[PDB]
């Protein structure tokens, strides 16, 4: 078909500036990040224009205190390298970086900014600390008995999100003048978010197994109580998860918190109206709501509430603008009666019905929420529909939905891919039907071509596991212990779940797409893969990349890693 | 930053370029050709302005008709690229309607000719080439062939052809259509190059020596060669090194198109015809006038009428992409013995000078880089890279003496001829840095090159390449296997000595494999067995495995896949 098209496409979508929302510095202007291609500056917007306040790219910004004059800027030291330093930015003169020489190079996690102090935690070789810098130089607060972040300070207390041992994660405090550390524990739940109120107690999003909850911690007791707000918005919607919280400088409390793909902002337990997608953080400005914004139909943009104007958000051109048409949530109906949340990206280069991709989602304990997707914006394109289901395993929808892949890898999951599939057919989205995923996504391919064939018309298979046995064998005591539970334990299910043992029910076109040196997707058993496949008469293609590296940035990337999966499928069409 | 949708638009219409190959001339006074066009290869009918699509899903060729013939035939690939053809009847009278020759098995179709009452035709299964003639009575086979061999011509009951019967030698060969068996003619001189049988039956040869090409006339009966006197002295005295086909016209003229430095020329009776700059192919009579196909590096392949040189039939290539080839040269490179390695040198408009060069290296190995259109070096041209072409040892065009030397010594002297053309790119002025790219024969010597010659190049792509002589031998249908044999000498050891994957170890630059997955030439097994020998060997290297594909790419999607990771992979070790 139009491969120049695809590319051109394909670039503009790497290249589109993606921004999020940090703050409100100066007086009165926005803080905003934006990242293009791999490449992150932080900006000024102020009513139309933005000003760049970094002058080469950067890592992140530290989180300022509502209006506070200046920005700290975290850059890697190296190209790549895993340790930052810190400089900072006066708002008033952009581009004018001061290196704060008092913090050696460490791995900075996180860190806000007083404006009189700022208070971050780094890992060094040594330890995970909180810091303080002020006037009389660099302070460490407290060790930390893991990796911890600052969410908030509020005068001298400030708090935190560890994780500290448990397999979840902990509220901290500690105090700006003493130091010190005190922990709570999440219990059967997770904290997921932090901030202080101006009676000097920490509320706290506290997720569960089901519902999560608005808690208030007492920092001088440790006492946990659901926090109830004036509007009982918040309470009815019955998030499952809290994304942020934060106080607004005039005391009331913004949170933005999600369920089933989808997030909402509430203002004392208030609903604000804002576009269908995923929401950042919440500022008031000038008076007024803004949000970033999200959604599998727009890039990160920042948004004014409760209109859904978009203050800042990248350019697409008008028509790869009207290719990337509307994205919805359906409950597909599987076997068990269960019900898969399934996202689906419809084309406005594709009729109804038209060509469709099942798109899965690697992990498998991840989400297909309502989220700019590249992947799935570049097959929309290309004039496909996609459809992304939430297969057992998947996180976003509680506990009990994760674990039921447990034990039962290419089974409960696979029928649920299948029912996604079946579903775009039955409604009459799919004229015809793919199947693409990268990871356990990969794995979820080729699990597809071999235990039902004739469901799709080609498949693409990226960073597969071919053989559970092999790897379990393979693998670093991380890896194993993943593949030990996922599989129960039982050698068999290992074997009989690998798709490498059923290579002779494929009757569709397989590409794949694949690392020559990851250390945890090695090329070996792919080779075997492939050696099986032409040994059995089987078409296939096959793109075997060095240096994958593990998310598309750049359009090098996606070269790589992406475009060979779309002109396959595309070819595949017609 | 590598220019990806740029490279990807310009391979795109290099590629998608019409491109047309002249068949001969059918029914009432129709051209027949086959051509690339709205994407794929297919036959056609021209006549009066326009063409007549004659198949329906693509092709690969059709079978040389004899002049008028109410019937074209279709030779079509049904193994998804592995080149197990069928053949596939067509009248003329009814364009689009096939009926497959059912009688004829899958087999790899060498060549053919149709007289209109049989299909006489060569083919390889897997033990043996032989020489078939099919009726409406059924399938004759009328004799085996010792390797090679390929029809050239028919005149009533006498069938002539060519055979690679040993030592890289072409014979010349005579069947009969009512009795079959099969007489071999050898020259002590050199080799056979293309037949014709005269009115007279004897058949027209031309003969390839050392370092001149000359025609004869062969007497089918009792074996006398002598030299063929012509009526003009042009050809003679055009001293041509190669003859790239001859024929009689059914006037009785005799067409020969003769080469030399990588450019032909047209010659009737003896006498040279005006023809554009380049190469030609076969000419046909057509309404009293020549016509001949016409390509040049930066002509694709046209359909022309002589002396005139103007086309009835050619793709148009963009300005912007005519640019991009700023020019083409033959040079003379020195080689480690002495030996001059003609070399073309395709210059791009889109690189400085010194810059950035590609050592494309051909196949065959008996092929040659002319005067000639190119698409690979094309695109590398559009892509910003130079382009150095050298007819190494064992290519065509320069005589027996140059193309027999390769015999027993594959990854020797041409891997010699191949580094010197290199060196003289770099030495001359003309790259800043060096790349080697081929495929088939052209990809074994980039596998070559890295483990015998490392540091030489920067990176190198490797295209449906040989790997190992030895297991491709074991995978090789009867006609691969012998003609293997001859190039090795029948040596095992040059078979193990000369395979790139016994020496993967010495590989210290980045590679690009790129191999069609149902290659049966070069086939994809032991480019599996690469791959865990470069991996077990902490080497760097891509692959891409080309679905439903072979050799022959018949397909715009086809070459886009096998030629655009090439280009993205040199265009990005630019940038490194
Ligand atoms: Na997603």
């Given at each position: 078909?139009?491969?120049?098209?695809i590319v051109?496409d394909?670039?503009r979508?790497?290249?589109?500036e993606?921004?999020?929302?940090?703050?409100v510095?100066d007086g009165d202007?926005?803080?905003?990040?934006?990242?293009?291609?791999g490449?992150?500056?932080?900006?000024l917007?102020?009513?139309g224009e933005?000003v760049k306040?970094?002058?080469?790219?950067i890592?992140?910004?530290?989180?300022?205190?509502?209006?506070?004059?200046?920005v700290?800027?975290?850059?890697?030291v190296?190209?790549g390298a895993?340790?930052?330093?810190?400089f900072?930015?006066?708002?008033?003169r952009?581009?004018?970086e001061?290196?704060?020489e008092?913090?050696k190079?460490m791995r900075?996690?996180?860190?806000?900014?007083?404006?009189?102090?700022?208070?971050?935690?780094?890992?060094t070789e040594?330890?995970?600390?909180?810091?303080?810098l002020?006037g009389?130089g660099?302070?460490e607060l407290?060790?930390?008995p893991?990796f911890?972040?600052?969410?908030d300070?509020?005068?001298?207390?400030?708090?935190g999100?560890?994780?500290?041992?448990?397999?979840?994660?902990?509220?901290?405090?500690?105090?700006?003048?003493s130091?010190g550390?005190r922990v709570?524990?999440?219990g059967?739940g997770s904290?997921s978010?932090?901030?202080?109120?101006?009676?000097?107690?920490?509320?706290?999003g506290?997720?569960?197994?089901?519902?999560?909850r608005?808690?208030?911690?007492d920092?001088r007791?440790?006492?946990?109580e659901?926090?109830?707000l004036?509007?009982?918005?918040?309470?009815?919607?019955?998030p499952?998860?809290?994304?942020?919280?934060?106080?607004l400088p005039?005391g009331?409390?913004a949170?933005?918190?999600?369920?089933?793909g989808?997030?909402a902002?509430?203002?004392?337990?208030?609903?604000?109206?804002?576009p269908?997608?995923?929401?950042?953080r919440?500022?008031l400005w000038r008076?007024?709501?803004?949000?970033?914004?999200?959604s599998?139909?727009?890039?990160?943009?920042?948004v004014?509430?409760?209109?859904?104007?978009p203050?800042?958000?990248?350019?697409?051109?008008?028509?790869?603008?009207?290719?990337?048409?509307?994205?919805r949530?359906?409950?597909?109906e599987?076997?068990?009666?269960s019900?898969?949340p399934?996202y689906?990206?419809?084309?406005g280069?594709?009729?109804?019905?038209?060509?469709?991709?099942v798109?899965?989602?690697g992990?498998?304990?991840?989400?297909?929420?309502?989220?700019?997707?590249?992947f799935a914006?570049?097959?929309?394109?290309?004039?496909?529909h996609?459809?992304?289901?939430?297969?057992?395993?998947?996180?976003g929808?509680?506990?009990?939905?994760?674990?039921?892949?447990?034990?039962?890898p290419?089974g409960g999951?696979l029928e649920?891919?299948?029912?996604a599939?079946?579903?775009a057919?039955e409604?009459?989205?799919?004229?015809?039907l793919?199947?693409?995923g990268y990871?356990y996504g990969?794995?979820?391919?080729?699990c597809?071509?071999?235990?039902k064939?004739?469901?799709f018309?080609?498949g693409v298979?990226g960073?597969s596991?071919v053989?559970?046995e092999?790897?379990?064998?393979?693998?670093?005591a991380?890896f194993?212990?993943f593949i030990?539970q996922?599989?129960?334990?039982s050698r068999?299910?290992?074997?009989?779940?690998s798709?490498i043992?059923?290579?002779?029910r494929?009757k569709?076109?397989?590409?794949?797409?694949?690392?020559?040196?990851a250390?945890r997707?090695?090329?070996?058993?792919?080779?075997?893969?492939?050696?099986?496949?032409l040994?059995?008469?089987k078409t296939f293609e096959?793109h075997?990349?060095?240096?994958?590296?593990?998310?598309?940035?750049?359009m090098?990337?996606?070269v790589?890693?992406?475009?060979?999966?779309?002109?396959?499928?595309?070819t595949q069409?017609?």
């Open positions: 078909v139009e491969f120049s098209r051109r394909v670039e979508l790497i290249a589109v993606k921004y999020s929302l940090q703050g510095v202007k926005l803080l905003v990040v934006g990242f293009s291609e490449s992150v500056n932080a900006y917007y102020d009513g933005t306040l970094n002058r080469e790219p890592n992140s910004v530290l989180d300022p205190h509502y209006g506070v004059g200046r700290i800027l975290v850059r890697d190296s190209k895993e340790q930052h330093a810190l900072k930015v006066n708002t008033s952009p581009g004018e001061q290196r704060l008092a913090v190079p900075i996690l996180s860190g806000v900014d007083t404006g009189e102090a700022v208070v971050f935690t780094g890992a040594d330890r995970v600390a909180l810091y303080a002020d009389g660099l302070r407290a060790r930390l893991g911890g972040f600052v969410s300070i509020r005068g001298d207390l400030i708090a999100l560890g994780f500290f041992g448990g397999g979840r994660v902990s509220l901290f405090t500690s105090n700006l003048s130091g550390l709570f524990d999440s059967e904290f978010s932090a901030s202080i109120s101006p009676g000097m107690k920490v509320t706290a506290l997720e569960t197994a089901r519902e999560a608005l808690v208030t911690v920092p007791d440790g006492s946990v659901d926090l109830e004036p509007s009982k918005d918040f309470s009815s919607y019955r499952t998860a809290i994304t942020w919280l934060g106080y005039d009331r409390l949170v933005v918190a999600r369920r089933e989808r997030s902002v509430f203002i004392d337990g208030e609903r604000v109206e804002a269908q997608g995923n929401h950042g919440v500022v008076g007024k709501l803004v949000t970033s914004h999200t599998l139909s727009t890039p990160p943009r920042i004014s509430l409760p209109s859904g104007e203050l800042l958000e990248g350019g697409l051109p008008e028509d790869l603008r009207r290719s990337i048409a509307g994205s949530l359906v409950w597909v599987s076997f068990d009666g019900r898969v399934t689906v990206l419809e084309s280069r594709a009729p109804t019905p038209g060509p469709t991709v798109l899965v989602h992990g498998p304990f991840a989400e297909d929420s309502d989220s700019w997707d590249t914006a570049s097959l929309a394109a290309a004039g496909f996609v459809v992304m289901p939430n297969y057992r395993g998947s996180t929808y509680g506990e009990e939905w994760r674990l039921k892949i447990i034990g039962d290419c999951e649920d891919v299948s029912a599939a079946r579903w057919r409604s009459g989205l799919a004229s015809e793919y199947i693409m990871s990969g794995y979820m391919t080729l597809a071509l071999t235990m064939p004739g469901l018309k080609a298979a960073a596991v053989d559970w092999e790897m379990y064998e393979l693998s670093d991380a194993r212990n030990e996922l599989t129960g334990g068999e299910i290992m074997r009989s779940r798709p043992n059923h290579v002779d494929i569709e076109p397989l590409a794949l797409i694949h690392p020559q040196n250390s997707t090695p090329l070996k058993p792919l080779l075997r893969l492939m050696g099986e496949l040994a059995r008469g096959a075997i990349i060095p240096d994958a590296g593990h998310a598309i940035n750049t090098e990337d996606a790589k890693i992406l475009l060979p999966a779309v002109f396959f499928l595309a069409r017609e």
